[PDB]
């Protein structure tokens, strides 16, 4: 008569490595680290990014005309751009601080384009400029949506108040035109002068006159440079022109979120799935602690690390008696 | 035929750890299911905890800075490297330290199942060195299920048993 | 009246391992002083060391930028976050398994303390199994401190012990 | 006659985690995790932190007349100011590089106030000029303690220079009038010109004249914007200016340390105590080596995590038997 | 004379674990070769990967800034204290633990011979409690190999060994 | 007949720490931290690094008359500046972003100067100006070799336009001459005009004239400040400038490399040795984990800790019976 102690063995295939051992059998093992790549991109936890289809952030924002228009409020978990969009800045010129704006608009719970300013209301002066480097399609000269370009001025000092009346920040943009030579200056404004001050809150922004030549880009040596500003709720803005300045006729009230997510680079397009953390190569999907498919992520995300693989023993040392 | 100290049984199918038995009525393989469970919820228990506690803070790809502030970049891309650094460290060091564990846990409770056994059995059996013990008296299907279930009663076999040892004392 | 198998003892109140005896002068718990003492050095050291090995650099609050550096300023909120992330998840899993082992520590040395008993009473006891030894021979308080102190003689009480013996083997 | 083996039990209810059980009743246990909020505001190793009361460090620092002046050379670990200051900048302005300031000036070993420059040296010129939007009492009219405006120019070049002869740093502040028209220029300076050349070391400062209108602040649709610079020992410092200057009078000698510490927010008083780690809403007195209590804090502190508690096992599993 | 209860031996020269014998043909030490080999693969293991999986990023000390960014040098000289304390901080608390188990791996790997001899033995041995085993019947050198090779026959020195304890009963 | 285990025993006087216990003598153990000062600065993976000698790195690319000229085509794996380099910017001006700079040329693969303007192209011109601030090995009047002093524009307007048609980017240097007064700008230019617009692909970079004196610095009141860019293969760079220019005659052609290192300040000499990881204090050849040498460091490197000490046990409790 005889009872014996002992343990399972199976036939799995499965090894760990431990602190003193390499590559022991296992009779189970669990994997703890996400290593699979699925090249989707997703909703996130519900959310859907905003898709700009070939258009970069700013030509979006201020309306290129190649670009589609934000009809209704919206919202979005992150902003999905082509690694090189075919639609930019039409009107050669720099967009002031594009990753401070970044931080504020990459993921919005309300976003609503609305007219700030009625352009009929100045007078000696025209608007709804045109230029032939924004055009809608070919040979026919347009210009940003959401932008008024005001010429003939002819020294005369526009003016503008703004009251902020909702609950939600007021994203404005507006631009400053750099022209070439006096005789150019001329023939846009009538006058040489030309200066702009624009006041949000307590803070002032002043645009002097600038008259300096620039290297032809797009059939131009003039330039207009581009500045953007949050009007809060319960603040006003102003404006002050005599010249050389794109009023912001449009604007975008918003409503931020505690969690910034940022732009995912790709030209794939999005698909009809949902991910809890996402990546400019696809989706993470998964509650596991680590992660060696991408440095930069987005959401509720593992740690990035450089392991191939990290898998834990749950079950005994696989060998059996012979 | 023999047990834990030569290997595992391909035979014990329904559980981690457990025990054979062989006696005039037949023979078979049957697990500890108590053993088996508790051990499962540890394991499970620690598992779910490495993972788990992968509370995070909400992670942003947003780590751009202007054409003239390279330096700013090179900053950021250093931050990132840094933790890069840690996580992969670290990740590594503790698989490899819990996977050592693990396996002495399975070690610590199979022995601890062999120890159960052995303290019953007292001298009313001779422990044959490979996990199983020869016992020294006709052991039935309830006095079997008894050593299992830590209720087999050493003074009711005891008389047999020395019988039996005098038989091989000499 | 049972011993560390079943559980713990409300009544041993000098010390955090020890014993319990019965004989015909009486009964009573004693810690083993020794083997407490020893304990509580290692558990105070390890507490102090997971304590005082955080020595760190001086620490600040200045983490302002100016207000067209926002992306500054994110950058040193995601460098927190970070560090946030590290320190959470470590100091997470160091109390886990630290209270693994330091559970298995106190198991090791109540082990520890019943096989010193158990080598020193060899044949001269019957081990019940449940922490406790049954001794074959009148053991006075002589006798169990002896037997406490790591001292008892064997050989002294082998001749009672063993005809002790012979009427439990009928 | 018997001999068991065992262990302590007693009636504690403490339980802990470990990484393969949870909620085990254990008879004695340590938190390593400092958890209590007090909201006190102490001194740092024993060193008092720079009450600005109700003043903000800018004012402080140019002597805004409802600021307290300071007499004694002093000393302090950190500063604490008011979420919301009711004495600010009162002529409307900004205050230059202050984050950096910060870095200076907040934990000091010594500081002191001294008279830099002989304002009676400049002849054909107004000096210690006053403006309503700076009173000490209601109704009055007053300015800065530490800086001298200067006035009635007339276009004329006034040229000072300074040794520093101690052995600690100096701090000085200026200040540049931009004035809102010709018309307040020439009130003010009596002259289209007014630009101003401040030299330390062999550091460079100039600030032409600037003639341009902002919005009313205060009061004000002119601007006096405000600079500071360092002068150390056996430094040199020189002054050039034509007008629309406001001169440092005043400056501060003071020693710098090596720990920074920083700004910390609350409208709390500071309370006799003394603390070994401060933080915006309470002392940290704790050696602990976690907190889970501010992500920002100052001095000697306990990492920050967002754990609910981390308590060690010290004693044995609580498990008498019946 | 004594063994691994009361301390290590200058004596055992070729290895880290092993035995020490005396019978009629005389006494020597001897390493366990095996146990000795398997424990310093272990040891070289942990060792090797505490300092292999160290795998980093390359390193820079571009790490400056202009005169009027000292807020952000102040960013990148604090990344470098956090960096500095997660460090520190874990690799003194590695180290501590590693040492802890290091010497615990060492003494399970002792144990794990005792136990090895003691089951061979039986009741033809008494547990002298010092580490050492007083055998009951004459063990010869080939005796003694069998022993260390977990060889050793029970039955066929089980009549000499009860002869010899019934006579320690008297 | 008796038989006894037992373990090793050794006359090691090593101990180590562990969690539970301290000063525990063992019979082996092995240090797991780097702790060795050796004062070499070395070769890095191989590769030389570049000796400044006594000149400062804007010193060295300008070419200041008193350091040496680069000939051949180089590569250095990171860059050694004396603390306080002899020879800097003689000819007193701020050098622009060098600390950008020095992340593009700190670790290269190539590096070769070139000739890119013919300057003897300009009529009714002064080239190749001199100046008493930037003398030879002692002294008469010299100049940065790269950067060509173009002098008595006279208001006349020059321009140059190159091609990059190399398949490397090109590093070039430029200056531009602020005057003291109007008879300094008419000594030296014949003319009160003198601004310059240098492009470099899309990007425009505009210095107008500006004539303002500053404090006297080695022997002048005026300044002239350095400016750098990088023309990218198959991209263009032009210059229009009518005066106060100083021209990047020469430039540097260079591969950048994956892996920036930086700077290494101290006076020691080059030594023939090669080293896996630098400092400024001494190499760190070692694949330990971690150092407590100095925080900053560059190449394949352990990391930096505090501990003075890290002992990994390997043998056994050194408790030998008596
Ligand atoms: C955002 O802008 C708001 C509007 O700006 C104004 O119009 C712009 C187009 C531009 O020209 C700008 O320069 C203007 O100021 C602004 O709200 C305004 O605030 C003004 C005070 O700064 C206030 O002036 C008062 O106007 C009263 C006129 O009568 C009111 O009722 C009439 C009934 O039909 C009707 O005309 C309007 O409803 C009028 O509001 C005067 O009675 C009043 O006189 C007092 O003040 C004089 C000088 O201070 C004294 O001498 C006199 O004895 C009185 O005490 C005063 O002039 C405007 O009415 C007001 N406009 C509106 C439409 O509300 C916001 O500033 C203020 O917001 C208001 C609501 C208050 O909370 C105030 O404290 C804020 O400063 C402005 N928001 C911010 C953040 O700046
Ligand atoms: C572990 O250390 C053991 C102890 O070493 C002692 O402490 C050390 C820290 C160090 O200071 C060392 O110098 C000390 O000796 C060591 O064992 C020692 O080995 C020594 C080398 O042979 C040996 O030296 C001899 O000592 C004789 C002195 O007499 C003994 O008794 C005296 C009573 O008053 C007293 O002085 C000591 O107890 C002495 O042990 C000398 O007479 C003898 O001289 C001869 O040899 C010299 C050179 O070899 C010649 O120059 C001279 O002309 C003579 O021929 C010699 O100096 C120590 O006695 C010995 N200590 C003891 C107590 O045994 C271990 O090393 C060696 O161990 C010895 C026993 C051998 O097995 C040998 O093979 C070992 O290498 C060391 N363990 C190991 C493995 O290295
Ligand atoms: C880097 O600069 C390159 C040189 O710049 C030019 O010279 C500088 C000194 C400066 O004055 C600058 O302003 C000049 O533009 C530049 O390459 C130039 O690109 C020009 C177009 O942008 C091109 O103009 C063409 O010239 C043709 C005639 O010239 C050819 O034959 C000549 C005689 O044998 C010979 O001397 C030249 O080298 C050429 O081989 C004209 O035929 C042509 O007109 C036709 O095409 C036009 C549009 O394509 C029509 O509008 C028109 O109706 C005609 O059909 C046109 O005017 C220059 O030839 C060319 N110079 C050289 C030496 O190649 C680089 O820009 C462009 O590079 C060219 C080759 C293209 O790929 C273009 O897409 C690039 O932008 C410039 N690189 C960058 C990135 O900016
Ligand atoms: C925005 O992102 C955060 C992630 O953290 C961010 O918080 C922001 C406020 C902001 O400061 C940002 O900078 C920061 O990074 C998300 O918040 C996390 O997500 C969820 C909340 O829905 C939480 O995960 C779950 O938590 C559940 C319950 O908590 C548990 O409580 C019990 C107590 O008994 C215990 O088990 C633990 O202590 C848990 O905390 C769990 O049941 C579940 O399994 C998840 O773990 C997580 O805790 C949140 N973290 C923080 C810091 O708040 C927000 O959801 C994001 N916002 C939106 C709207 O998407
Ligand atoms: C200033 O803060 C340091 C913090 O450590 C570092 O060193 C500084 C010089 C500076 O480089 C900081 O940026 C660094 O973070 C602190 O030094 C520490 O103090 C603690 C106090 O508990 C000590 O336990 C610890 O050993 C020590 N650590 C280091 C790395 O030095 C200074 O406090 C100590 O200063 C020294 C000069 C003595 O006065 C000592 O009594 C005091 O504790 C602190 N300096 C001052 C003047 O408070
Ligand atoms: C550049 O430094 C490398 C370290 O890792 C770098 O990878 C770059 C692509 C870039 O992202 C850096 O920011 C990052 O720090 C180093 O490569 C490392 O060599 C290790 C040697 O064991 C390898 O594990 C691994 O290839 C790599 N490490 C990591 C984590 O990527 C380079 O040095 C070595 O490069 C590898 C590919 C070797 O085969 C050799 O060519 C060389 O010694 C280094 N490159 C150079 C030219 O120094
Ligand atoms: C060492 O002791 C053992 C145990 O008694 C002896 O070997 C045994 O010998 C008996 C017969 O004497 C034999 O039945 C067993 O098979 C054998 N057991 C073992 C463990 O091998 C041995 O004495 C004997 O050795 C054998 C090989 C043989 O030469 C025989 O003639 C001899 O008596 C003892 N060795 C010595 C040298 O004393
Ligand atoms: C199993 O072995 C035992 C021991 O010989 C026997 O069962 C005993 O039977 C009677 C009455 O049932 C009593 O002596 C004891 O109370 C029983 N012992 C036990 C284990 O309860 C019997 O020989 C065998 N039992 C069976 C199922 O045949
Ligand atoms: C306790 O019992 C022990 C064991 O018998 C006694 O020790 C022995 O006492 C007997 C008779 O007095 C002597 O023959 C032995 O020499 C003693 N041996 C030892 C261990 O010293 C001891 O005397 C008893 N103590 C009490 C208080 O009765
Ligand atoms: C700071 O100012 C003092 C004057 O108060 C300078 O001292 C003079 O220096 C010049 C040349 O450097 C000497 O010729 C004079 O003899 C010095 N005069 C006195 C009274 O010391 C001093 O040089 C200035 N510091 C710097 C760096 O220029
Ligand atoms: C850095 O470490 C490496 C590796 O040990 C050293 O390279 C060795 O140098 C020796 C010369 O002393 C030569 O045998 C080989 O070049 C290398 N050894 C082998 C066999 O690979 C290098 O010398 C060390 N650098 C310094 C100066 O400390
Ligand atoms: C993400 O996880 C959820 C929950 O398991 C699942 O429903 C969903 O299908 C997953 N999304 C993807 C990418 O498959």
Redesign the interface.
Known sequence: ???????????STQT???????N?P??SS?S??EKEHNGLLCKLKGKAPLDLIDCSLPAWLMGNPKCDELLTASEWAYIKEDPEPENGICF?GDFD?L??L??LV?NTDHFRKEKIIDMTRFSDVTTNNVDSACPYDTNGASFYRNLNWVQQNKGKQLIFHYQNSENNPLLIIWGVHQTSNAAEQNTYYGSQTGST?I?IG?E?N?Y?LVI????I?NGHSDRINYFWGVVNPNQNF?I?STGNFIWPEYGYFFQKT???????KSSEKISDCDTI?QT?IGAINS????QNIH?????????????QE????????????? | IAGFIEGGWQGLIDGWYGYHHQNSEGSGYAADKEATQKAVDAITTKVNNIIDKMNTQFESTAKEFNKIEMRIKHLSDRVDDGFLDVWSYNAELLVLLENERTLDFHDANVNNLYQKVKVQLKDNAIDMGNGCFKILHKCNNTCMDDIKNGTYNYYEYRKESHLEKQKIDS
């Open positions: 008569d005889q009872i014996c102690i002992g343990y399972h063995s199976n036939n760990v490595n431990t602190l003193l051992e390499s022991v296992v009779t669990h703890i680290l050669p601080s990753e401070d970044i931080l990459s001050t006041t307590e002032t002043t002097p300096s030549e620039s290297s880009l102003s002050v505690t969690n910034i997510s940022g732009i995912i953390c400019k509650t596991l602690p680590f440095q930069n992520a987005i959401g509720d995300c593992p740690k990035y690390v450089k392991a990290l898998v834990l023993a749950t079950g005994l040392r696989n060998n059996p008696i012979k």
